[PDB]
PDB file of all heavy atoms in Angstrom:
ATOM      1  N   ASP B  87      20.177 -15.020  16.992  1.00 79.52           N
ATOM      2  CA  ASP B  87      18.889 -14.347  17.112  1.00 79.52           C
ATOM      3  C   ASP B  87      18.702 -13.369  15.954  1.00 79.52           C
ATOM      4  O   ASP B  87      17.656 -13.373  15.335  1.00 79.52           O
ATOM      5  CB  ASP B  87      18.785 -13.628  18.460  1.00 79.52           C
ATOM      6  CG  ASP B  87      19.047 -14.537  19.637  1.00 79.52           C
ATOM      7  OD1 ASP B  87      18.573 -15.691  19.612  1.00 79.52           O
ATOM      8  OD2 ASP B  87      19.661 -14.073  20.614  1.00 79.52           O
ATOM      9  N   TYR B  88      19.728 -12.591  15.611  1.00 79.04           N
ATOM     10  CA  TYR B  88      19.670 -11.666  14.472  1.00 79.04           C
ATOM     11  C   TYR B  88      19.432 -12.388  13.170  1.00 79.04           C
ATOM     12  O   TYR B  88      18.550 -11.993  12.411  1.00 79.04           O
ATOM     13  CB  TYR B  88      20.945 -10.819  14.407  1.00 79.04           C
ATOM     14  CG  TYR B  88      20.930  -9.701  15.428  1.00 79.04           C
ATOM     15  CD1 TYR B  88      21.696  -9.777  16.584  1.00 79.04           C
ATOM     16  CD2 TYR B  88      20.122  -8.586  15.252  1.00 79.04           C
ATOM     17  CE1 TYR B  88      21.643  -8.777  17.552  1.00 79.04           C
ATOM     18  CE2 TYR B  88      20.053  -7.584  16.217  1.00 79.04           C
ATOM     19  CZ  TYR B  88      20.829  -7.672  17.357  1.00 79.04           C
ATOM     20  OH  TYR B  88      20.760  -6.672  18.289  1.00 79.04           O
ATOM     21  N   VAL B  89      20.163 -13.486  12.925  1.00 76.91           N
ATOM     22  CA  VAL B  89      19.992 -14.276  11.701  1.00 76.91           C
ATOM     23  C   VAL B  89      18.538 -14.750  11.569  1.00 76.91           C
ATOM     24  O   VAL B  89      17.907 -14.551  10.530  1.00 76.91           O
ATOM     25  CB  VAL B  89      20.969 -15.474  11.693  1.00 76.91           C
ATOM     26  CG1 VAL B  89      20.545 -16.533  10.685  1.00 76.91           C
ATOM     27  CG2 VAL B  89      22.405 -15.027  11.459  1.00 76.91           C
ATOM     28  N   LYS B  90      18.021 -15.359  12.646  1.00 73.16           N
ATOM     29  CA  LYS B  90      16.704 -15.962  12.742  1.00 73.16           C
ATOM     30  C   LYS B  90      15.599 -14.931  12.631  1.00 73.16           C
ATOM     31  O   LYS B  90      14.683 -15.093  11.837  1.00 73.16           O
ATOM     32  CB  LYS B  90      16.596 -16.684  14.076  1.00 73.16           C
ATOM     33  CG  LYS B  90      17.292 -18.021  14.084  1.00 73.16           C
ATOM     34  CD  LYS B  90      17.578 -18.523  15.481  1.00 73.16           C
ATOM     35  CE  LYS B  90      16.354 -18.656  16.328  1.00 73.16           C
ATOM     36  NZ  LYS B  90      16.655 -19.347  17.607  1.00 73.16           N
ATOM     37  N   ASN B  91      15.707 -13.873  13.428  1.00 71.59           N
ATOM     38  CA  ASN B  91      14.767 -12.783  13.514  1.00 71.59           C
ATOM     39  C   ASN B  91      14.687 -11.945  12.263  1.00 71.59           C
ATOM     40  O   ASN B  91      13.580 -11.609  11.859  1.00 71.59           O
ATOM     41  CB  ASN B  91      15.028 -11.956  14.773  1.00 71.59           C
ATOM     42  CG  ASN B  91      14.851 -12.767  16.053  1.00 71.59           C
ATOM     43  OD1 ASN B  91      14.108 -13.750  16.101  1.00 71.59           O
ATOM     44  ND2 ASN B  91      15.566 -12.400  17.108  1.00 71.59           N
ATOM     45  N   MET B  92      15.833 -11.651  11.626  1.00 71.45           N
ATOM     46  CA  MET B  92      15.830 -10.909  10.372  1.00 71.45           C
ATOM     47  C   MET B  92      15.260 -11.736   9.228  1.00 71.45           C
ATOM     48  O   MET B  92      14.547 -11.178   8.397  1.00 71.45           O
ATOM     49  CB  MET B  92      17.223 -10.400  10.013  1.00 71.45           C
ATOM     50  CG  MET B  92      17.646  -9.206  10.864  1.00 71.45           C
ATOM     51  SD  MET B  92      19.139  -8.449  10.202  1.00 71.45           S
ATOM     52  CE  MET B  92      20.250  -8.943  11.391  1.00 71.45           C
ATOM     53  N   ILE B  93      15.583 -13.053   9.162  1.00 72.41           N
ATOM     54  CA  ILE B  93      15.090 -13.898   8.067  1.00 72.41           C
ATOM     55  C   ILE B  93      13.565 -14.125   8.172  1.00 72.41           C
ATOM     56  O   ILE B  93      12.860 -13.943   7.182  1.00 72.41           O
ATOM     57  CB  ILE B  93      15.899 -15.219   7.881  1.00 72.41           C
ATOM     58  CG1 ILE B  93      17.310 -14.946   7.313  1.00 72.41           C
ATOM     59  CG2 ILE B  93      15.146 -16.197   6.969  1.00 72.41           C
ATOM     60  CD1 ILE B  93      18.359 -16.025   7.617  1.00 72.41           C
ATOM     61  N   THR B  94      13.079 -14.503   9.372  1.00 73.33           N
ATOM     62  CA  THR B  94      11.663 -14.770   9.632  1.00 73.33           C
ATOM     63  C   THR B  94      10.752 -13.519   9.567  1.00 73.33           C
ATOM     64  O   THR B  94       9.566 -13.646   9.255  1.00 73.33           O
ATOM     65  CB  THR B  94      11.477 -15.519  10.962  1.00 73.33           C
ATOM     66  OG1 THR B  94      12.001 -14.717  12.021  1.00 73.33           O
ATOM     67  CG2 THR B  94      12.144 -16.877  10.965  1.00 73.33           C
ATOM     68  N   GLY B  95      11.299 -12.342   9.884  1.00 76.40           N
ATOM     69  CA  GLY B  95      10.514 -11.112   9.900  1.00 76.40           C
ATOM     70  C   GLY B  95      10.027 -10.757  11.290  1.00 76.40           C
ATOM     71  O   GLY B  95       9.254  -9.811  11.438  1.00 76.40           O
ATOM     72  N   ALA B  96      10.472 -11.502  12.328  1.00 78.04           N
ATOM     73  CA  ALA B  96      10.157 -11.205  13.732  1.00 78.04           C
ATOM     74  C   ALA B  96      10.829  -9.855  14.098  1.00 78.04           C
ATOM     75  O   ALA B  96      10.218  -9.033  14.778  1.00 78.04           O
ATOM     76  CB  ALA B  96      10.687 -12.322  14.628  1.00 78.04           C
ATOM     77  N   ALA B  97      12.065  -9.607  13.597  1.00 80.27           N
ATOM     78  CA  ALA B  97      12.752  -8.325  13.792  1.00 80.27           C
ATOM     79  C   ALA B  97      12.580  -7.513  12.502  1.00 80.27           C
ATOM     80  O   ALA B  97      13.489  -7.446  11.670  1.00 80.27           O
ATOM     81  CB  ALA B  97      14.231  -8.533  14.109  1.00 80.27           C
ATOM     82  N   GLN B  98      11.369  -6.973  12.295  1.00 84.90           N
ATOM     83  CA  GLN B  98      11.069  -6.152  11.122  1.00 84.90           C
ATOM     84  C   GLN B  98      11.705  -4.742  11.332  1.00 84.90           C
ATOM     85  O   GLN B  98      11.570  -4.142  12.405  1.00 84.90           O
ATOM     86  CB  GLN B  98       9.538  -6.130  10.847  1.00 84.90           C
ATOM     87  CG  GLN B  98       8.951  -4.877  10.141  1.00 84.90           C
ATOM     88  CD  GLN B  98       9.493  -4.569   8.755  1.00 84.90           C
ATOM     89  OE1 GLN B  98      10.032  -3.481   8.508  1.00 84.90           O
ATOM     90  NE2 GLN B  98       9.299  -5.476   7.805  1.00 84.90           N
ATOM     91  N   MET B  99      12.451  -4.265  10.332  1.00 83.07           N
ATOM     92  CA  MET B  99      13.120  -2.974  10.406  1.00 83.07           C
ATOM     93  C   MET B  99      12.905  -2.132   9.159  1.00 83.07           C
ATOM     94  O   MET B  99      13.166  -2.583   8.041  1.00 83.07           O
ATOM     95  CB  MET B  99      14.629  -3.133  10.680  1.00 83.07           C
ATOM     96  CG  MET B  99      14.952  -3.723  12.035  1.00 83.07           C
ATOM     97  SD  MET B  99      16.724  -4.070  12.230  1.00 83.07           S
ATOM     98  CE  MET B  99      16.915  -5.473  11.174  1.00 83.07           C
ATOM     99  N   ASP B 100      12.442  -0.901   9.365  1.00 83.60           N
ATOM    100  CA  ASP B 100      12.320   0.106   8.315  1.00 83.60           C
ATOM    101  C   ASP B 100      13.687   0.778   8.195  1.00 83.60           C
ATOM    102  O   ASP B 100      14.024   1.307   7.154  1.00 83.60           O
ATOM    103  CB  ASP B 100      11.229   1.136   8.645  1.00 83.60           C
ATOM    104  CG  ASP B 100       9.857   0.511   8.669  1.00 83.60           C
ATOM    105  OD1 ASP B 100       9.542  -0.268   7.732  1.00 83.60           O
ATOM    106  OD2 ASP B 100       9.138   0.704   9.673  1.00 83.60           O
ATOM    107  N   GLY B 101      14.474   0.680   9.252  1.00 82.73           N
ATOM    108  CA  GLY B 101      15.837   1.176   9.293  1.00 82.73           C
ATOM    109  C   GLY B 101      16.617   0.540  10.427  1.00 82.73           C
ATOM    110  O   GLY B 101      16.069   0.311  11.510  1.00 82.73           O
ATOM    111  N   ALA B 102      17.908   0.253  10.188  1.00 84.60           N
ATOM    112  CA  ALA B 102      18.723  -0.338  11.238  1.00 84.60           C
ATOM    113  C   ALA B 102      19.786   0.609  11.738  1.00 84.60           C
ATOM    114  O   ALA B 102      20.282   1.436  10.986  1.00 84.60           O
ATOM    115  CB  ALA B 102      19.353  -1.641  10.755  1.00 84.60           C
TER     116      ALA B 102
END
Side-chain angles (χ1 to χ4, degrees):
Chain B
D87 306 319
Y88 282 105
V89 163
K90 282 161 58 171
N91 298 334
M92 285 191 252
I93 289 156
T94 60
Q98 152 60 238
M99 294 173 288
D100 294 314

